[PDB]
Design a protein around this ligand. Sequence first.
Ligand SMILES: Nc1ncnc2c1ncn2[C@@H]1O[C@H](COP(=O)(O)OP(=O)(O)O)[C@@H](O)[C@H]1O
Ligand SMILES: Nc1ncnc2c1ncn2[C@@H]1O[C@H](COP(=O)(O)OP(=O)(O)O)[C@@H](O)[C@H]1O
Ligand SMILES: Nc1ncnc2c1ncn2[C@@H]1O[C@H](COP(=O)(O)OP(=O)(O)O)[C@@H](O)[C@H]1O
Ligand SMILES: [Mg+2]
Ligand SMILES: [Mg+2]
Ligand SMILES: [Mg+2]
Lengths: 538, 541, 548
Amino acid sequence: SLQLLNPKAESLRRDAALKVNVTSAEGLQSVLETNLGPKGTLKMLVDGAGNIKLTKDGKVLLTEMQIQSPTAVLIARAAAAQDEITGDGTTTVVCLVGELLRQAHRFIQEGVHPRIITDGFEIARKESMKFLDEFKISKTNLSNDREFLLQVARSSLLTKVDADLTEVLTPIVTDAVLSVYDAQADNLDLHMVEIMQMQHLSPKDTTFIKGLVLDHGGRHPDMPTRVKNAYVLILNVSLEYEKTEVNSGFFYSSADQRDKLAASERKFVDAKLKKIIDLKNEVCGMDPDKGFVIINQKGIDPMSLDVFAKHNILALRRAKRRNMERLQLVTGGEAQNSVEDLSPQILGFSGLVYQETIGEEKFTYVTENTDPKSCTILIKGSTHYALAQTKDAVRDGLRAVANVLKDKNIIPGAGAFYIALSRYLRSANMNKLGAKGKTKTGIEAFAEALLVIPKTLVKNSGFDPLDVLAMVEDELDDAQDSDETRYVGVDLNIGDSCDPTIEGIWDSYRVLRNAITGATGIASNLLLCDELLRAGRS
Amino acid sequence: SLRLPQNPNAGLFKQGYNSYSNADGQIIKSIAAIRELHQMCLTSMGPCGRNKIIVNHLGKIIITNDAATMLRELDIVHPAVKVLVMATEQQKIDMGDGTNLVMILAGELLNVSEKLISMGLSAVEIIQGYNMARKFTLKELDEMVVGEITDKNDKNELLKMIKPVISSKKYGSEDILSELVSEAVSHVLPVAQQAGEIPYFNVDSIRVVKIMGGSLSNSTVIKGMVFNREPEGHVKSLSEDKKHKVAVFTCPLDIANTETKGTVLLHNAQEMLDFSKGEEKQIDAMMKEIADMGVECIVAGAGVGELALHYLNRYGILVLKVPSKFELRRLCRVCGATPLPRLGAPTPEELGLVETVKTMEIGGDRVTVFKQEQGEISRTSTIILRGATQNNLDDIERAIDDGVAAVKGLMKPSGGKLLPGAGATEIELISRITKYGERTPGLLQLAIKQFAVAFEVVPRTLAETAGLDVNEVLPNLYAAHNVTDHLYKGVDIDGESDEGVKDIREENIYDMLATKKFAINVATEAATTVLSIDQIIMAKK
Amino acid sequence: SLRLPQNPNAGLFKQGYNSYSNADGQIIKSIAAIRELHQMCLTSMGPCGRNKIIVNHLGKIIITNDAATMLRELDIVHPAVKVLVMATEQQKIDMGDGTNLVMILAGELLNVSEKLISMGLSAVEIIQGYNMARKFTLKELDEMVVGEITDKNDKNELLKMIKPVISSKKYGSEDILSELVSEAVSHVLPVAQQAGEIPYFNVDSIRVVKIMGGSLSNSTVIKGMVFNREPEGHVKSLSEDKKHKVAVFTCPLDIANTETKGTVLLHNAQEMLDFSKGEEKQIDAMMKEIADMGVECIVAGAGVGELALHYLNRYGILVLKVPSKFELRRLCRVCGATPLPRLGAPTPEELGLVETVKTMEIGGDRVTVFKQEQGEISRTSTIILRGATQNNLDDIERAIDDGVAAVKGLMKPSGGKLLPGAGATEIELISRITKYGERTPGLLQLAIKQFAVAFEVVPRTLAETAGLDVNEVLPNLYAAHNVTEPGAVKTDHLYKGVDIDGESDEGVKDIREENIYDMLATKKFAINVATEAATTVLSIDQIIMAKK
Ligand SMILES: Nc1ncnc2c1ncn2[C@@H]1O[C@H](COP(=O)(O)OP(=O)(O)O)[C@@H](O)[C@H]1O
Ligand SMILES: Nc1ncnc2c1ncn2[C@@H]1O[C@H](COP(=O)(O)OP(=O)(O)O)[C@@H](O)[C@H]1O
Ligand SMILES: Nc1ncnc2c1ncn2[C@@H]1O[C@H](COP(=O)(O)OP(=O)(O)O)[C@@H](O)[C@H]1O
Ligand SMILES: [Mg+2]
Ligand SMILES: [Mg+2]
Ligand SMILES: [Mg+2]
């Protein structure tokens, strides 16, 4: 009856739209299921311009590839929102949504209405949140031990690159936080670390730096590249005027005023430079090994470069907006706009300042600080995709170690949490039902759908997932009667079980909590949608 | 049964996206695709290598045997080739030497993996096979170095470094091209008894100015720079002025005006009579102080007005435009002066010294000669090339750029040392990797044995491009290492190659140690990426 | 998001195949598709019904109000409409009567079914509601029958049967069209009363000849068949009377030819001289035996050679050409003759009797008159139909065939079994089924009560096409049926019916004086076909079409 409204309108009703939600989610999952786990496949994204991007994360894959199917758009927007807050769980949510639909689609063909199926999802999900509190283990972060942070940070890097580059990047992402902490305020920000993209050495030769690194080099040759003692002066004002707000001009009567009107513009430039030179010599005069460095966010007049060249002052222009807040935390200084108010108290301090020339550009390095409140990570690569592949591995590793400090509770990984929910959701007894036979149908579909995560890990390793999970259920049966609590994981090497706590594999709290809740809502709305309609004016 | 189901995934993604995944293709298929471009580089390898003509869509023809230059101008749709193309780009940017070795070695590592995958060896264990074999390769390169040299100063010491690099490119010239680079390096290096702390060296100290016509043997080395411009106002004084102070001004010579647009405002006619002589005496005051300091040459990057050129012509002061800013700092290093944006008056400490300046035509076009004899130059020089064709001189400039790149790679680290060439090092690495596989049992032995097989392409390419049989000379080369004199065995290119043994120390053909270490790390990582990509995703157009 | 999945796995069938199911309102669209052609036949119902013009692809125009004839030339698309189209064609073939009733009744059963489906009644329960109500409907028709035709032929009784049937088809004048058809029926009846023989009748016996020009009042009835023919040799009025002896030959008149390689063989000039005079003596010897028997007319079934027509003009024997078959077959039924293939002397017992053969100008061309007289009666009489337009001549021919088909209804059953006309038949069934719906417990009473509502279309259509308000006239008619039956017998209220124009306000008193009645044998099959036509549409849950 839709064509009577518009001739060009099309629709698919009841099972016609139901087969779409099951097929489109299964087709999208089949592509992204091969990326789950450390043995997962590596995708190469090639656009029309010729750019190559190697990443195993679903956030970049779904962003570069436009999805024509409307059903998979909900999964893409759900996996995108999962990467925003938790920085992880893109592939996990995609594998859960497609599995919740296929497991529930089998009951629909048996005559089960989708309404009671959505009931079994919400009742079983609330029981999983209660089990999540008992299954998680609280940790003490007051000791700031390295061994605990190395294993948690390595688990995220094993899903990106091989073990050779992982062991190099594991202490880097562990050092990515370090001196950035607060006991009382609880505020933790990962935007203070800087991601530098440059081709130097090899991707495995990268190292961590304890101080800020900038991409701007020395503009004048006489500016010393290496400075032992430098006072960073933050200047947000532009020394070179781009334009005057009120339109004005210079009208000279005689040619003698031409050089005078040109010197009139020389007074405003020298007025800002007069207080800067007096600030350097204010501390101590004729003092070797003590330099003075200025980092400016706006442009610097090339004419004024010779003014600082005689005093051996390093100047940097066109700094990033996020760089100003980082100068206060690293160098310990204070952000200043104009030069009207200066003092040695607002000046920063750095123990080592040097610059290196890589290619046709020069980079500024700052390190050796007393109590730096921020740091950086230098990402080097041998090619174009090496910078994008390592960056996606670090950014996904940053959010992993942050949730450890945000939430002291740590949940073991390696599919140990998904298998534990299987036996718990089989029989709910009289606790939560709400109906006779109506709710138990949706709970059974949600319980068996949580086993896709451990089975997908085994399929990427080339083993039999049914034989691996068979020995898992045999160990959990004897562990209940032996009065011993054991966490059984999945080992992809020998095709046997393991202990995530001993093997060093853990998962974040916010990643698993938002994945179960996020995948439940997407799969529920697709089961509750019986018609797919398209209408509009071209 | 007439039409196919079209698959359900056809509606997923778009029709422009193409997929190549495991068991879906690739898997030694795509490896067979790069063999077309791999054979292109095999014919260009060695002193007998063949140059390749490439015509870009713009119409410019670049004839060179360098793999990094050829793959840059070629538009390649196949994505996995760009992994090898970008691998050769790193070799040219950083080290600048070994671009042909990276493309050939990385291409053979994918060819020897054809047998490994055919035997059922997964790509996961293949990556671990090359990584452990690459670490053992870099550790064995230090014990094979007999060419350790602490000098890096005398000209004869560069015959074992710069000359072997020039032997490959433009093999028709050996002592002619080597003398041009060796003399240019001797000029840019400062004269001192002992220079430590790794004195700074850059590729901008040696330059190449190509002039059409003339034989290559007629070329010479000039300590200054040669630019093509038009002098104005007078003929040079030759040596009558001897050393003359040269002032380099960044801003043009003219009465200083504000950045905003001004105009003349005349209220009465009394200022009109003084307006003509006002601009004359205003700029003359700044030009008079320059002649009092003895400055015979003024260089202003921007355009100089006629009012400023009028005064400088009678005092005999040279004016040179130098429009480009990059070449402006190069003339400053010849005289050793400081670029001054202000006009003011020249200060004695900021002025340089140039012995003589002359204007002559090397190829029929007038150029200005900055050559300075007996003077002090710092990190500046040039090489004037003479050739009949423009395309032949293009690769010669790249051969000089590759010759000075070896000096940069030699000077910056502790040292580049030396390695035996002409297939001597590649054969010695075969016996090291082969014996390394038998020391540690396991499944990685298949990847270690095939890793040494890929080293056989370099020594046979010299024999293949020489018109020799690789089933005779090459097998007889392994028997020569049976056992110092067994490390100096190498490949011979000559009509006398029938014996297949020529001493390397006779011609002194050596390769840098730091170049081979950087070439293997890039070639191994490039071949590792192709085997580590399970699925390929394409796009429309 | 930009483009739909466009029904995945639709490649199982060709792109031209479409699937339509009872769900998604397609069963409602199918009922709505009936109303497009239903209103076309509503304005054509009754004596005031309006004829329709339908132009085919060849340009032929057929103007008729008959639902069975109109649906023939129309190109039907919707599949369930063809169920209604082919249902009206069967009613015209079988009983030759009540064609517009099947079209309207089957369409109203689907209209009342739209409310039944909306209330949730399954297709199975709706079918069972109409089947149980139809069995009760057929039983009440036999209880409400009044009067009978009794004797086969009567001058007055044939005005109570053919006249009300032809009143709806080209109404015009009443007694003019009724006398023309009633006269031709009395001639084809064998009569022979008190003999106990089984009566017999043929619907193809009466033939209607369309002749343009003149007026309807100038039409007459001819006992013999009328053809357009030109006599070859001469025209003869045959005023010498004493009737005639006529013979019919289905084979042509000519020298018998060998079916294989007929060829003239002449060996010598002696056989050539006698070959020309030999063929002349053959026809002379064969035609002499026919002339000696007193045969003044010969009917030929094919082309006759010129040599045979020569000797026929010598003895003054007429020549008739009867092409094809059926035209010659009905000629012998008039004169009572038996055709024989040979050219020899016919048997005197097989010769026919025709008193006069006349040729006169009627519509501008020469027609031959086979008309019979009082004695030596003939069968398969023809009716000369005069009219100004040929379009009126086509439907009146079908209007006469409707009266001829009504005569067939007087043979197979025990009698005529007249029913009250003017829509009084379907109105009385409304009150009877309403009482029947209450006597049946359960949920099946919904389809039974609505089955009687579909009978309200007959009084509403006759009132709407008559220019009267259906809101004022229809409820006033139930006042006669709302008083049920009194404490005394002899109730004449069953004769109330719908009136056309005039004074309105019900009217026409009791229809017994109007003499318009209906046939019981027609209403039996009219309800059965119309019910199965609507049942078939409601019994189809899914409809599949090809190429469109
Ligand atoms: N080495 C491993 N062994 C077993 N399971 C692992 C291993 N590494 C990761 N996993 C499991 O894979 C899941 C997803 O991890 P990861 O790939 O980092 O996130 P995503 O799938 O969102 O990219 C985690 O829940 C974890 O339990
Ligand atoms: N005259 C010669 N005789 C024998 N071998 C030579 C001669 N000239 C060059 N070769 C060999 O040819 C090889 C060419 O290698 P080349 O492509 O220059 O290496 P790279 O790519 O590092 O520059 C050198 O290793 C050198 O040993
Ligand atoms: N003059 C009249 N007054 C009242 N009713 C009439 C009159 N003429 C015809 N009718 C009724 O109209 C009905 C029309 O029947 P119709 O459907 O036309 O039969 P058919 O389709 O066989 O011609 C008849 O049943 C008859 O009872
Ligand atoms: Mg992850
Ligand atoms: Mg070389
Ligand atoms: Mg009728």
